[PDB]
Design an enzyme around this catalytic site. Structure first.
Site, PDB file in Angstrom:
ATOM      1  N   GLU A   8       2.169   1.648  -3.194  1.00 59.81           N
ATOM      2  CA  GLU A   8       0.935   1.873  -3.777  1.00 59.81           C
ATOM      3  C   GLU A   8       0.085   3.838  -3.785  1.00 59.81           C
ATOM      4  O   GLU A   8       0.265   4.929  -5.078  1.00 59.81           O
ATOM      5  CB  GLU A   8      -0.465   1.341  -3.521  1.00 59.81           C
ATOM      6  N   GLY A  57       0.237  -1.288   0.056  1.00 64.19           N
ATOM      7  CA  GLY A  57      -0.131  -0.151   0.110  1.00 64.19           C
ATOM      8  C   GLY A  57       1.303   1.484  -0.289  1.00 64.19           C
ATOM      9  O   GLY A  57       0.531   1.865  -0.469  1.00 64.19           O
TER      10      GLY A  57
END
Lengths: 263, 263, 263
Positions: free
Chosen positions: A118, A115
């Site tokens: 990301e 994440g």
């Protein structure tokens, strides 16, 4: 929904108009969790609404981690339906940085995993430090990236290397990420924040409306439902009408600096 | 079950789960013909339906060519109508490797030209020997690549270099392919198989279902007919309802090795 | 008249079939204006209709510039609608080079800025001189690229560096442009127009109908409305129906050279 966060620092530099957003869970390597995402959402929403915010510099507290994955214990506690919901949500929150008409730069000061990778990929530009590391290790848990990674990694480093990184869970260093296109620049960590501010300076002396239309039109190219050429023509006439174009053209023929106001 | 082929070698290694698929026409530099395409169709379907098959390693027999072109005299004896059909068929067959939830690694041991280059390009990963060479010579014959090359070469190499390679019919060294993005890694021919084995081993220690979900999700980012982010959200919920995911997370918090079963 | 332009040079070598198009306004560094853009229109239309034109080489006059910007005074005099219409017209004109069945090489002998950088980017291929510099400084005026630069520069350079270039207005040298993918080759200015002739020589020996068929099919893979695989299949069958393919195919079997004729 004011400017008070348990897991972020929100330092607006009224002077430059650059807003530094810092993920601030240092004992946890700035990992993400339900609360931190929601604060990212709130922070992003407020910066887009505040005229004094001209741009965004995103970073992590400390010298070891930008954002290193997420609370796996939290994640494991969700059902499949809630997990689909957490993914839809994280995609929305991150996309808010990508779709933003104010430049957004990620200053990767350490690990950018999962994440966290990301999050960095959702920003318009990345600048990595000497000691930075990237990777998408989700498959090591029987997961896959759920915050846009399967979409944004191919558009930054191509199909083949996006597959390799997401299939093997390899962690790479800043020089590899540079060579692949995952970051725009690598510099020493002590120089990281200052280099980004110089880079934001270079953009914040241009037409603010023009900046937003460029980001919009590039985004339209990558969205198959949008026509980037049509959007570009409409943006072109739109920017033409603004006071900043009339000002930018006067400053170009008279060879003085332009005073843009966002209008 | 009938895993005996005129033109291919189907060696399934039962320890690792790696199916080595070898194109076996070394006297004709492994060129493609109606029979060979049809055997790859059959082998792919068998590989995708056998739970013992966890990955595919695609290579050429005889350490001089991977796959070099196609039986052109065979091709010339077809109507334009049948020729369009042979195109649709060959590219349907190749797409089975692209869309395979099991990782497909092309070990390019020598010449990959025309349809042979297109075959390599349809795999998820390419590892090449020092002595391999890549090209799309179809315009030399008044033809164009008809098995996906006009689509996949841009994906791997960018529009500009893809136009160059296909309009000039240049042949390029593996060093140049690994620079443009057309292969992931280059090694001496004697290490090629050993390198591909280590690389397959990284992926096979990960969640089998997660791997296949990654592949489905980067694929949807490349076809306009599929959203992409929505695919990722639905696949992220899918991973969460699998045994492998409960195991992966427990193994992570307990800091121990994870034993995935593919469920 | 036939090849009578106030701002262009229309030099067609009748042997090789290479049309050389030179933007000829060296006092203003070959800056575009409405007349130059409209003349490039008619030049392109003329070149595509003429069977003696088999390729296009585009370049600039002096040593200083390829095409350096646009007459900003002329631009600022338009209404808001006329600007939008100028953007619509300029992307139409530049797309004529992009969609051309006849190959189009840009020889960038110097400054390629704004409009001129967008004109270079619409050509299939770019060869730069070592003295070349590129940029899209539209945001310095409070404009954005309005000739497809928001669409084609990501195609050539990827999202992250396209955003950096368009948002910083940075100028780069042919060194950096080659590294990024913005040009295909870098050669000394002295060698520039010779290199491109050698490069056009590789393509002009191939099937002319087949060259424009690959150009169609690559273009279709970037258009989300088209489906490039289907277009490739239709192109393969259309190739079969030409005499150059029978020529090309006969010549490969009876291992001899091939004389194509484009029909």
């Amino acid at each position: 929904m004011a400017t008070s966060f348990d897991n972020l620092l929100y330092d607006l530099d009224a002077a430059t108009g650059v807003l530094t957003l810092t993920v601030n869970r240092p004992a946890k390597l700035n990992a993400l969790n339900a609360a931190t995402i929601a604060e990212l959402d709130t922070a992003a929403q407020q910066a887009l609404a505040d005229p004094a915010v001209r741009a965004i510099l995103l970073t992590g507290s400390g010298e070891k981690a930008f954002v290193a994955g997420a609370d796996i214990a939290e994640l494991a506690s969700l059902t499949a339906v809630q997990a689909a919901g957490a993914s839809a949500y994280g995609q929305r929150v991150f996309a808010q940085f990508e779709r933003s008409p104010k430049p957004v730069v990620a200053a990767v000061n350490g690990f950018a995993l999962g994440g966290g990778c990301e999050l960095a990929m959702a920003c318009h530009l990345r600048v990595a430090a000497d000691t930075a590391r990237f990777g998408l290790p989700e498959v090591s848990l029987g997961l896959l990236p759920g915050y846009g990674g399967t979409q944004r990694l191919p558009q930054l480093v191509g199909k083949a290397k996006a597959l390799e990184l997401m299939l093997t869970a390899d962690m790479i260093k800043a020089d590899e990420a540079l060579r692949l296109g995952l970051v725009n620049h690598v510099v020493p960590l002590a120089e990281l924040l200052g280099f980004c501010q110089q880079l934001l300076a270079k953009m914040l002396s241009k037409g603010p409306v023009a900046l937003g239309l460029v980001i919009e039109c590039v985004n339209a190219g990558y969205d198959p439902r949008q026509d980037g050429y049509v959007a570009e023509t409409e943006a072109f006439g739109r920017a033409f009408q603004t006071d900043d174009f009339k000002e930018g053209t006067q400053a170009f023929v008279e060879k003085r600096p332009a005073v843009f106001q966002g209008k």
